[PDB]
Design a protein around this ligand. Structure first.
Ligand SMILES: Nc1ncnc2c1ncn2[C@@H]1O[C@H](COP(=O)(O)OP(=O)(O)NP(=O)(O)O)[C@@H](O)[C@H]1O
Ligand SMILES: [Mg+2]
Ligand SMILES: [Mg+2]
Ligand SMILES: [Mg+2]
Ligand SMILES: [Mg+2]
Length: 289
């Protein structure tokens, strides 16, 4: 509500995010364009109607409408996290195994807790836009998942699939093949879970490259850096992913470390071209434990 904005710490395609004061404390304030009211709606929807509290999910505080510069602003107020996004984090620092396992574990927990229905409780939720920019790194080393603005929900009791009406689509670079060739089954909640696993496999590759094993690392590179431009188009991503069926190549320096060898095994099982073959968030969480 009555919060003072102190610094804007970044912008994406759907709004700005500010570091602000509430009760003299640091909170993140994502300000939506009214051009993107549907994502502010969907995120407010989940965080108000679903008990969505968990160590590895961005903590919610409030949602509100306010007036600035003679115009209406849609605020989503969440936990501020000093160290920013996994994507920024991976570029400024290298990882050792205990910090790299702590990251991929935390994301695995967050995704699985989203993906399963709890009775007592919460419906099953698929994310639909998971990527390194939509994961935050917290002061205690755990990562959490943010941006529920494209989320779909399913409840076993009703067996009703809630898809929303947001016409926004996922970040093109991270789309699974079934999204790109438009043969995803839109009526089947599990399809959406398998889109998330695929992207998770991409995030996994991003993290592994930055773990120091025998004093060597790769530089941070986004998935398919070598075959598609920045801001790749819908058809750019289709040629690589669907037609020629390329996957990020695994550096064989990783075969000179035991963990990197387990994560290479994890990733490949997240990006089978056949979505039924892909691991679930529940296995991935298990293996990493
Ligand atoms: N809760 C938060 N606390 C601290 N920093 C945040 C928080 N949320 C977002 N940020 C930072 O603000 C940046 C802008 O985020 P955002 O507006 O969500 O766009 P994006 O997620 O980076 N990519 P996109 O929204 O698809 O264009 C992020 O990349 C983070 O670095
Ligand atoms: Mg975002
Ligand atoms: Mg974000
Ligand atoms: Mg969020
Ligand atoms: Mg959103």
């Amino acid at each position: 509500r009555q919060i003072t904005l102190l610094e804007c710490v970044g912008k994406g395609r759907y709004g700005e995010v500010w570091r602000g004061s509430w009760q003299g404390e640091n909170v993140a304030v994502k300000i939506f364009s009214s051009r993107d009211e549907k994502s502010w709606f969907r995120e407010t929807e989940l965080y108000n109607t679903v008990m969505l509290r968990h160590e590895n999910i961005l903590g919610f505080i409030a949602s509100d409408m306010t007036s600035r510069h003679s115009s209406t602003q849609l605020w989503l107020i969440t936990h501020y996290h000093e160290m920013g996004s996994l994507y920024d984090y991976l570029q400024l620092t290298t990882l050792d195994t205990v910090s790299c396992l702590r990251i991929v574990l935390s994301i695995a927990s967050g995704l699985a807790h989203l993906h399963i229905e709890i009775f007592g409780g919460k419906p099953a939720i698929a994310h639909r836009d998971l990527k390194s920019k939509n994961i935050l790194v917290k002061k205690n080393g755990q990562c959490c998942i943010a941006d529920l603005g494209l989320a779909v929900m399913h409840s076993q009791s009703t067996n009703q699939l809630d898809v929303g009406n947001n016409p926004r689509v996922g970040t093109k670079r991270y789309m699974a093949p079934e999204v790109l060739d438009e043969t995803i089954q839109v009526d089947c909640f599990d399809s959406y879970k398998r889109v998330d696993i695929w992207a998770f496999g991409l995030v996994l590759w991003e993290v592994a490259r930055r773990m120091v094993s025998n004093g060597i690392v790769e530089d941070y590179k986004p998935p398919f850096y070598d075959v598609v431009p920045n801001d790749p188009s819908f058809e750019d991503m289709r040629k690589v992913v669907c037609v020629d069926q390329q996957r990020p190549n695994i550096p064989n320096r990783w075969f000179s470390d035991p963990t990197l060898t387990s994560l290479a095994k994890l990733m490949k099982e997240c990006w089978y071209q056949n979505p039924s073959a892909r691991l679930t968030a529940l296995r991935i969480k298990a293996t990493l434990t």
